[PDB]
Amino acid sequence: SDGNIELTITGMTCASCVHNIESKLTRTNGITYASVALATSKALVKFDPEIIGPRDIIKIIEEIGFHASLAQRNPNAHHLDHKMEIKQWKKSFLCSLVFGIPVMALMIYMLIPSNEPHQSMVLDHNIIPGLSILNLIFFILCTFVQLLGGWYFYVQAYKSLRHRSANMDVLIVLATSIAYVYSLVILVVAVAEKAERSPVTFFDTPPMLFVFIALGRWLEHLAKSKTSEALAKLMSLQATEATVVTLGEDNLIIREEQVPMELVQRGDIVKVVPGGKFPVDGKVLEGNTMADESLITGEAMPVTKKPGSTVIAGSINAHGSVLIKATHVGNDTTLAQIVKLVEEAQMSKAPIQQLADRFSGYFVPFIIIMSTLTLVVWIVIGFIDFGVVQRYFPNPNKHISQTEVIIRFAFQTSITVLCIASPSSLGLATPTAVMVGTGVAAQNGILIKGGKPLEMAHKIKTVMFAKTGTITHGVPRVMRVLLLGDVATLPLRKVLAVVGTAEASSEHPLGVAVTKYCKEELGTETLGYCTDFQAVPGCGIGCKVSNVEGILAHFSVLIGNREWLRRNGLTISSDVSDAMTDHEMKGQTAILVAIDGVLCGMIAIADAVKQEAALAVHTLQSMGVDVVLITGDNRKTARAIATQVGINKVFAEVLPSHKVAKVQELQNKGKKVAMVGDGVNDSPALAQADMGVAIGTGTDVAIEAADVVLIRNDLLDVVASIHLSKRTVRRIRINLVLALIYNLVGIPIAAGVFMPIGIVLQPWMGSAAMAASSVSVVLSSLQLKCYKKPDLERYEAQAHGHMKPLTASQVSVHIG
Ligand SMILES: [Pt+2]
């Protein structure tokens, strides 16, 4: 609501444009944030709304030199497809192959000596003093290459040089221009002086530079396109046509229509045939069927659906034809929300990613300075102290004087050094790994958002679980109802009816269960009236019940915890004090009933802890992560459930009001704490925590407090979320090393420092060793896709043997 804009930018090729754009925008006044995604080719900028407008931002971007526009909503396939660039680079490589074969054949013909040559390689027979026929062929071919093959690089360098910054094609244009001009000058000098020998010239490298450049830039885009498979599959999964039906009286088909999604609205009725996708989320009206959504939520078992259930826009129907009423259409569907969340997942760049952006904006000038320094130092060392170099070039050649060999060596070693740098491999090391990790997570239910939580989960030491809806099933079962007061004037029917009618006003999770229970044993569909319903969260409810004859034909009611009756001034007895103890330490909480000050009786209410809770708590304990449980229930109830799962420290009697101070005090020691909440209920608690985990939120992934969202209601996915985040963060570190070892080794070698050992590279060898670098970085990222989701028996394996039981004695409780 702060005028936060999202833009799409076309034309970002080099990895150095991101730093330029971000610095130019942030340095401009009135802007506090700017994130640019090279892979997605978009931008996310927030600013002060009144000072500047979106058109001003577009104008600034156009001034920088990029074409930008407002973000579109549905069309994203071509951005993530990379079709145009792959096709163009493949076409360019095939086009440039026609001039790489002849020069390569001529070069290889020179090297291998024939055992019985026809004339002993007279292909270098001079015709005009200084101009051999070989050099004529090479000159013609190189002129055609420069006037026909390097045009695109010339255009890119010209458009980048119009502004202060320099992209990565400057290196290519400089290399080719120098290798052309020096050779042309030396050839003209040789011809004019009428020398007998044609000097060795630099007319062979431009033909071999462009072939390797195009091959590298084609393979690199072909490898990139495999990183966006998850987004491509998710986006190209929603349907575009629906079968609109109209119901006369008894859901009878009046008529049929086919409508696009942009015209269908909420409340419409649509039918699906077997084998067809559900176009819109909605409520099942009639018909029994079952559908599988393994491409949406990641589960393998196909869910069964009955009239009155919900559907997911994207699942495939199997049995029969079913009519449903549309509820969410368009951007409101779960699939659209998932796609959007994953899209802005690659926007919050990590600090290491920001450093990598900063380093790659100051790379090309560094390479140019290093190349010029190498050229000058080689010339001066050759011209001043020839002894050191002639120790390794001792041969005296009459055809070319020793002055001319030093210059040629200096030029060769100053061209190879700037022809071997690979800024792109350093630029795209981390973004590809981040994208692949997020996609492989999203295809498994875990819905990690943002790049910061990726490395946040690496160093978390304490995890925090809530009780209801997170550890246990969340749908409580009523065990039994006990009566403590009178039986004649307070029969079972009366007390259950009045408590059910009293709680019917409320919506607290445990009370709806007891109300529906009361309905099911009394068998009465009617109910009375409740008035003066005082509802204090975390304390209890107090009210009065009227119209008590509705159910009894077949009243100040105070319901709450023990202190709730203390607040209303009700006495303390001993038989009631140990009444729930028989059940309280068995893991079922108990609610006490007192109407008009009369201790009517007690009810035991239970909710079963999920099976997975036994192992998920232990794996984190063995993985090096501590665990703490928090709840607002009684201390004895927390103690019982803590032992059943194995958490030593618990925070009980926490009223739902504060629930942030306990998180606050844990973070006060400098450690990192992440809480596993439930969603809309515990939004303030998740936001304060460093990483928010929202578990069991099906088709409600639009959560802003939490930075990690889990669709399936499984505690083991918490383990997989941490276990997969570590496996990703390690990949950036490995990727950022291969881009530094290669550069800090390929520069000295191309600088000719290894001359005494006797290893020197011609420039064409300085490009074939660069195209392999860019692809190798991407190929190291794609290895993450080989990730099998661990199964229940998988965790049973490494956890087998050692499961240490614990008793309530070694269980601490809260403080204050
Ligand atoms: Pt380059």
Query: Could you tell me the residue ranges of all domains in the chain?
Result: 5-72, 239-332, 371-419, 446-470+610-722, 477-606
Q: How far is the CA of 734 from the centre of ligand 1 (A)?
A: 22
147: exposed, middle or buried (Cβ count in 10 Å: 0-12, 13-18, 19+): exposed
Contacts 24+ apart (CB under 8 A), 81-89: 81/225, 81/228, 81/232, 82/221, 82/224, 82/225, 82/228, 85/221, 86/218, 86/221, 86/222, 86/225, 89/214, 89/217, 89/218, 89/221
Q: Which residues contact 54 (CB under 8 A, 6 or more apart)?
A: 3, 5, 7, 70
Q: How far apart are CA 526 and CA 518, in angstroms?
A: 11
Q: What DSSP string describes 105-151?
A: HHHHHHHSPPSS-SSS-GGG-EEETTEEHHHHHHHHHHHHHHHHTSH
Q: How far is the CA of 234 from the centre of ligand 1 (A)?
A: 35
Secondary-structure class of domain 239-332 per CATH = mainly beta
Q: Write out the two tokens for 528.
A: 């009375």
Per-residue DSSP letter, 783: G
Q: Specify which residues 541 forms β-bridges with.
A: 535, 559
Q: How far apart are CA 676 and CA 682, in angstroms?
A: 10
Helix (H) or strand (E) holding 287: none
Q: How far is the CA of 423 from the centre of ligand 1 (A)?
A: 7
Q: Write out the two tokens for 386.
A: 């020839």
Per the rule left: phi > 0, alpha: psi between -120 and 50, beta: everything else, 329 is beta
Helix (H, G, I), strand (E, B) or coil at 80: helix
Helix (H) or strand (E) holding 792: helix 792-798
Q: How far is the CA of 773 from the centre of ligand 1 (A)?
A: 11
Q: How far is the CA of 737 from the centre of ligand 1 (A)?
A: 19
Residues 129/131/133/138 CA torsion (nearest 10 deg): 170
Q: How far is the CA of 277 from the centre of ligand 1 (A)?
A: 48
Per-residue DSSP letter, 710: B
Q: How far apart are CA 407 and CA 405, in angstroms?
A: 5
Indicate if 477-606 has the same CATH topology as 239-332.
no
Q: How far is the CA of 135 from the centre of ligand 1 (A)?
A: 27
Q: Where are the alpha helices (DSSP H) in 274-350?
A: 334-343
Q: What's at 256, amino acid-wise?
A: E
Q: How far is the CA of 23 from the centre of ligand 1 (A)?
A: 24
Q: Which residues contact 622 (CB under 8 A, 6 or more apart)?
A: 799
Helix (H) or strand (E) holding 575: helix 574-577
Helix (H, G, I), strand (E, B) or coil at 591: strand
Cβ–Cβ < 8 Å for 627, 617: yes
Q: How far is the CA of 418 from the centre of ligand 1 (A)?
A: 7
Per-residue DSSP letter, 158: H
Residue in the block written with tokens 């590809």: 432
Q: Write out the two tokens for 714.
A: 């499984």
Q: How far is the CA of 768 from the centre of ligand 1 (A)?
A: 11
Q: How far is the CA of 758 from the centre of ligand 1 (A)?
A: 25
Q: How far is the CA of 99 from the centre of ligand 1 (A)?
A: 20
Residue 157 half-sphere exposure toward CB, CA atoms < 13 A: 16
Cα–Cα nearest to 720, from 611, 623, 614: 623
Q: How far is the CA of 565 from the centre of ligand 1 (A)?
A: 79
Q: What angle (nearest 5°) sits at the alpha carbon of residue 736, between those of residues 735 and 742?
A: 90
Q: Write out the two tokens for 530.
A: 């409740």
Cβ–Cβ < 8 Å for 647, 462: no
Q: How far apart are CA 542 and CA 597, in angstroms?
A: 11
Which architecture does CATH list for 5-72?
A: 2-Layer Sandwich (3.30)
Q: Which residues contact 737 (CB under 8 A, 6 or more apart)?
A: none
Q: How far apart are CA 557 and CA 533, in angstroms?
A: 9
Cα–Cα nearest to 436, from 226, 693, 722: 226
Q: How far apart are CA 662 and CA 678, in angstroms?
A: 17
Q: How far is the CA of 226 from the centre of ligand 1 (A)?
A: 24
Q: How far apart are CA 617 and CA 707, in angstroms?
A: 21
Residue in the block written with tokens 């009725």: 269
Cα–Cα nearest to 682, from 510, 473, 467, 536: 467
Q: Write out the two tokens for 646.
A: 């194995």
Q: What's at 192, amino acid-wise?
A: A
Cβ–Cβ < 8 Å for 813, 635: yes
Handedness of CA 102, 106, 108, 113 (dihedral sign): positive
255: exposed, middle or buried (Cβ count in 10 Å: 0-12, 13-18, 19+): exposed
Cα–Cα nearest to 459, from 814, 687, 115, 729: 729
Q: How far is the CA of 350 from the centre of ligand 1 (A)?
A: 27
Cα–Cα nearest to 640, from 472, 461, 475, 469: 472
Q: How far apart are CA 517 and CA 494, in angstroms?
A: 14
**Three state DSSP letters for 330-346:** HHHCHHHHHHHHHHHHH
Q: In the sheet where 281-286 sits, what is the strand order?
A: 253-260, 241-247, 269-272, 322-328, 281-286, 310-311
Cα–Cα nearest to 318, from 282, 283, 287, 285: 287
Q: How far is the CA of 269 from the centre of ligand 1 (A)?
A: 59
Residue in the block written with tokens 């779960």: 334
Q: Write out the two tokens for 79.
A: 């951005």
Neighbours of 741 (CB within 10 A): 10
Cβ–Cβ < 8 Å for 557, 499: yes
Q: Write out the two tokens for 209.
A: 């530079």
Handedness of CA 595, 598, 601, 603 (dihedral sign): positive
Q: How far is the CA of 185 from the centre of ligand 1 (A)?
A: 24
Q: Which residues contact 32 (CB under 8 A, 6 or more apart)?
A: 46, 47, 48
Supply the Cα-derived Rg of the chain in whole angstroms: 37
Q: How far is the CA of 431 from the centre of ligand 1 (A)?
A: 20
Residues whose Cβ atom is located within 5 A of ion ligand 1 = 171
Q: How far is the CA of 21 from the centre of ligand 1 (A)?
A: 21
Q: How far is the CA of 187 from the centre of ligand 1 (A)?
A: 27
Domain at 477-606, CATH homologous superfamily: Calcium-transporting ATPase, cytoplasmic domain N (3.40.1110.10)
Q: How far is the CA of 766 from the centre of ligand 1 (A)?
A: 10
Q: How far is the CA of 171 from the centre of ligand 1 (A)?
A: 5
Q: How far is the CA of 172 from the centre of ligand 1 (A)?
A: 5
Cβ–Cβ < 8 Å for 228, 236: no
Per the rule left: phi > 0, alpha: psi between -120 and 50, beta: everything else, 752 is left
Q: How far is the CA of 767 from the centre of ligand 1 (A)?
A: 8
Q: How far is the CA of 154 from the centre of ligand 1 (A)?
A: 13
Q: How far apart are CA 120 and CA 133, in angstroms?
A: 15
Parallel/antiparallel/unpaired status of strands 529-536 and 477-483: unpaired
CA distances from 691 to 457, 508, 704 (A): 7, 27, 12
Cβ–Cβ < 8 Å for 80, 231: yes
Q: How far apart are CA 539 and CA 563, in angstroms?
A: 7
Q: How far is the CA of 747 from the centre of ligand 1 (A)?
A: 12
CA distances from 629 to 162, 220, 581, 617, 663 (A): 61, 48, 21, 11, 11
Q: How far is the CA of 721 from the centre of ligand 1 (A)?
A: 39
Q: How far is the CA of 813 from the centre of ligand 1 (A)?
A: 63
Cβ–Cβ < 8 Å for 314, 278: yes
Q: How far apart are CA 273 and CA 246, in angstroms?
A: 16
Question: Under CATH, what is the fold of the domain 446-470+610-722?
Answer: Rossmann fold (3.40.50)
Q: How far apart are CA 404 and CA 401, in angstroms?
A: 6
Q: How far is the CA of 420 from the centre of ligand 1 (A)?
A: 6
CA distances from 328 to 233, 268, 310, 510 (A): 21, 10, 11, 30
Q: Where are the alpha helices (DSSP H) in 443-548?
A: 452-456, 492-503, 509-522
Cα–Cα nearest to 568, from 609, 540, 606, 529: 540
Q: How far is the CA of 260 from the centre of ligand 1 (A)?
A: 48
Q: How far is the CA of 152 from the centre of ligand 1 (A)?
A: 14
Q: How far apart are CA 306 and CA 47, in angstroms?
A: 49
Q: How far is the CA of 84 from the centre of ligand 1 (A)?
A: 22
Residues 311/313/316/318 CA torsion (nearest 10 deg): 30
Cβ–Cβ < 8 Å for 540, 570: no
Cβ–Cβ < 8 Å for 123, 138: no
Q: How far is the CA of 739 from the centre of ligand 1 (A)?
A: 14
Resolution in A: 3.6
Q: How far is the CA of 417 from the centre of ligand 1 (A)?
A: 10
Within the chain, how many helices (H) and strands (E) appear? 31, 27
Q: How far is the CA of 199 from the centre of ligand 1 (A)?
A: 27
Q: How far apart are CA 765 and CA 762, in angstroms?
A: 6
Cβ–Cβ < 8 Å for 295, 314: yes
